[PDB]
């Protein structure tokens, strides 16, 4: 049952509003496996937030 820990990271670790979700955000869905693998250092919240931001950025990159 992977859904519970995915919900954990998305809700408490990423603190995303409910309008953003694993179903509606493809790059978030892709990065969720990597984020769930590293169960440690969930206390360092800004690191996960910043990595998600730069993943979105590279998704939008045209160069």
């Amino acid at each position: 049952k992977r859904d519970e820990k995915h919900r954990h990271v998305v809700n408490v670790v990423l603190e995303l509003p409910t309008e953003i979700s694993e179903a509606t955000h493809p790059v978030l869905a892709t990065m969720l496996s990597k984020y769930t693998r590293m169960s440690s250092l969930f206390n360092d919240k800004c690191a996960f937030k910043l990595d998600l931001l730069r993943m979105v950025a590279v998704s939008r990159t045209r160069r």
Binding site: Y35, M38, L41, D44, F48, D51, R54, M55, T61
Partner: protein, 49 residues
């Protein structure tokens, strides 16, 4: 931090890929994260001037 760095303590910044451990490694002392480009002598002197 204290000792001469030596290449075991130098890490390459992966740009545009997931690097959560590096982002947590911010404000850490010892491991130095660098880009893999190394400045040549001519541009070194230009920076100096």
């Amino acid at each position: 931090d204290r000792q001469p760095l030596n290449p075991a303590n130098i890490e390459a910044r992966h740009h545009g890929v997931s690097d959560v451990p590096r982002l947590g490694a911010m404000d850490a002392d010892e491991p130095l994260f660098v880009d893999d480009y190394r400045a040549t002598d001519d541009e070194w002197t230009l920076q100096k001037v």
